[PDB]
C-alpha cells in the first residue's frame, strides 16, 4: 500500500509540474486571446458593483 500510494503521488506530482511548464510557455507566446479577455473581465466586474 505504501508503494502504491508513493507511485500515485509521484505520478500526480510529475503531471502537475508538466502542466505548470506548459501554462507558462503558452503565456509567453504572445497570446491575443488572453489580452482581449483581460480587458473584458475588468469592465464586467466594475458594472456589477455600481
Amino acid at each position: 500500500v505504501r508503494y502504491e500510494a508513493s507511485l500515485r503521488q509521484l505520478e500526480q506530482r510529475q503531471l502537475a509540474k508538466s502542466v505548470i511548464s506548459r501554462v507558462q510557455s503558452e503565456l509567453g507566446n504572445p497570446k491575443f486571446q488572453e489580452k482581449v479577455l483581460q480587458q473584458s473581465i475588468s469592465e464586467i466586474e466594475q458594472l456589477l458593483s455600481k
Binding site: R8, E11, Q12, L15, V19, S42, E45
Partner: protein, 93 residues
C-alpha cells in the same frame, strides 16, 4: 481509482473569479511595519502578497505593527499587504 489525477484537476479548475490593504514600510525580525490597513481589527490576520501570514498587534496612528507567522526573507518594503477580516481561529471537533 481510474486516473486519480484527473479528479483533482477538475475540482481546482474554477476558483479565482472574485479577487479584484497596506503597503509595507519596513520589515525585520518577524515584524513588519505597514502603512494603511485602515479597517483592520486589533489581533486580525493578514496575508502578505508573498504568501506568509501575520497578525496585527499594534494599530498605531500612522501605521500597523505586524508579527509574522513565517520567515521574512520573503517580505520586502512596499510589498502589498492584505486584510483577511478574521481574528485568529482554529478548527475543532
Amino acid at each position: 481509482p481510474t486516473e486519480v489525477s484527473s479528479i483533482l484537476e477538475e475540482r481546482i479548475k474554477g476558483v479565482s473569479d472574485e479577487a479584484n490593504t497596506g503597503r509595507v514600510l519596513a520589515v525585520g525580525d518577524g515584524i513588519a511595519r505597514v502603512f494603511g490597513l485602515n479597517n483592520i481589527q486589533a489581533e486580525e490576520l493578514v496575508e502578505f502578497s508573498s504568501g506568509v501570514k501575520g497578525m496585527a498587534l499594534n494599530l498605531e496612528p500612522g501605521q500597523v505593527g505586524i508579527v509574522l507567522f513565517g520567515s521574512d526573507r520573503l517580505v520586502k518594503e512596499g510589498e502589498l499587504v492584505k486584510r483577511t477580516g478574521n481574528i485568529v481561529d482554529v478548527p475543532v471537533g
